[PDB]
């Protein structure tokens, strides 16, 4: 039971189901203590059973329990676990993550196969803790907090933090990913190259693997943290390190379009 | 039906009313049982509707007040041809009722909303996904408190131990409790008036060290 921004309240339907159950149970106990006739007690027990039904799995038997003035079936525990929006699929086998971002892709022709153009602001946000520590190693900020407050306001951002950010991401890689991810090449590891502008620069040769053209396609970036994660991304997931299709064994990174045309 | 309670619930509470009627009935008055029973049944049904219809429970008299306010506002909009203001409602409610009371009553009459309320055109997303958790400390807040304790331990060793530890003894860094003058006095073998004058003294010398290194600025927000 939580108070939202507007001061109003938001709550889970399980509270309503529980309320029904408790009310009917209490009423049943009172009816038993007062020596109610068999019919009344019977009906009450039936209602109790259907209340436990609605609580555990709603809509399974009979009409689904809905709130007053609404056709929306209340969400039971079974509905919570099961389904595409269920606990498993939504919150377990997949998750939303920190140290991640997204933006519109743009052709990268000047990039080496292992590189991707990464907008400055994005990298500043994604690597932010590392940038704080680096700012503390140098004389930009006395400590971490001051550096964070310094980065809170854009007008307070000078060039030294960019020059430090350059030293932060050096040698490290990031993960580029495009939806839908059909095969493991829907995610590839690239060495970020800080670029002006808000767009991510993508190498032409990986476009086939990503099934990406630029009509306004967008991609997500992720930052592997641990030395282990970075080792995995650099050795295993590097774009330049996978040149052949795991399916056919044929090259998945090969000349296409303009390249073939010129050659 | 339609008051927030299911048909069968109303039927059961009404059954309780009927039981009360049976137990309290007197055949001496030559009255049909339906007459005397109807009152108790309506009473029970109404008590139920007033009691169980809200997720956040409100007392029955306050419920009567809110319903009264609703009917009043409905009459007012009925005659005026528009939704009444708080002042007009305050007027049609008689004496004792001003705009503020009407506003607070309507504010307290607000029912909560479901977290599973549909957002988009599909079953894809829910209302509750857009609500942050303000309770649990973010990693930044945790690191803030941690580094706060770090720097506070950094600048507190600059001078004589016992007085700084007396300062901490008052502010509960050691034991996490504020000790009274007689107690915090009796700790290290002193008593009374001196202790406070030491704390200030500490806070005087505490004004020295930090002021030279100026490490405490950002944590003050």
């Amino acid at each position: 039971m939580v108070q939202v921004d507007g001061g109003r309240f938001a709550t889970s339907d399980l509270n309503d189901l529980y309320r029904r159950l408790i009310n009917r149970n209490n009423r049943l106990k009172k009816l038993l203590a007062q020596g109610a006739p068999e019919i009344i007690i019977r009906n009450e027990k039936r209602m109790l059973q259907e209340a436990v039904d609605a609580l555990l799995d709603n809509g399974r038997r009979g009409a689904p329990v809905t709130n007053p003035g609404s056709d929306r079936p209340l969400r039971s525990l079974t509905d919570i676990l099961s389904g595409k929006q269920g606990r498993f699929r939504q919150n377990l086998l997949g998750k939303r993550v920190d140290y991640s971002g997204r933006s519109v892709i743009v052709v990268g022709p000047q990039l080496k196969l292992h590189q991707c153009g990464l907008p400055k602001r994005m990298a500043l946000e994604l690597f932010k803790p590392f940038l704080l520590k680096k700012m503390e190693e140098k004389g930009i900020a006395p400590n971490v907090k001051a550096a964070r407050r310094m980065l809170e306001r854009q007008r307070d951002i000078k060039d030294e933090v960019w020059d430090a950010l350059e030293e932060v991401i050096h040698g490290k890689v990031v993960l580029l990913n495009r939806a839908p991810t059909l095969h493991r090449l829907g995610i590839q590891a690239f060495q970020p190259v800080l670029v002006e502008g808000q767009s991510i620069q993508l190498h032409p040769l990986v476009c086939e693997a990503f099934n990406a053209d630029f009509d306004g396609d967008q991609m997500a970036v992720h930052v592997p943290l641990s030395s282990f994660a970075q080792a995995e991304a650099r050795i295993q997931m590097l774009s330049a390190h996978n040149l052949l299709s795991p399916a056919s064994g044929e090259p998945l990174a090969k000349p296409s379009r303009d390249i073939i045309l010129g050659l | 039906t339609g008051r927030g309670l299911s048909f069968l619930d109303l039927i059961q509470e009404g059954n309780q009313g009927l039981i009360r009627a049976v137990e309290k009935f007197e055949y001496k008055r030559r009255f049909k049982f339906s007459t005397y029973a109807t009152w108790w049944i309506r009473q029970a049904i109404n008590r139920a509707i007033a009691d169980q219809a809200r997720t956040i429970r409100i007392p029955v008299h306050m419920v009567e007040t809110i319903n009264k306010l609703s009917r009043t506002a409905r009459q007012l909009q009925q005659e005026l041809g528009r939704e009444p203001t708080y002042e007009e409602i305050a007027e049609a409610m008689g004496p004792g009722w001003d705009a503020k009371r009407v506003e607070e009553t309507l504010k307290i009459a607000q029912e909560p909303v479901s977290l599973e309320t549909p957002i988009g055109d599909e079953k894809d997303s829910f209302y509750g996904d857009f609500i942050p958790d303000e309770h649990l400390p973010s990693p930044v807040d945790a690191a803030t408190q941690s580094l706060l304790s770090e720097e506070l331990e950094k600048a507190l060793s600059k001078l004589s131990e016992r007085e700084a530890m007396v300062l901490k003894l008052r502010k509960g860094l050691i034991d996490g409790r504020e000790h009274t003058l007689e107690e915090v006095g009796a700790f290290f073998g002193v008593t009374r008036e001196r202790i406070r004058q030491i704390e200030n003294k500490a806070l005087r010398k505490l004004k020295y060290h930090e002021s030279r290194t100026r490490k405490l600025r950002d944590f003050l927000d």
Partner: peptide
């Protein structure tokens, strides 16, 4: 199948 119909039937027995 319907609790209300069932209860109304059980009511008409008396």
């Amino acid at each position: 199948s319907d609790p209300v119909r069932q209860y109304l039937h059980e009511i008409g027995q008396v």
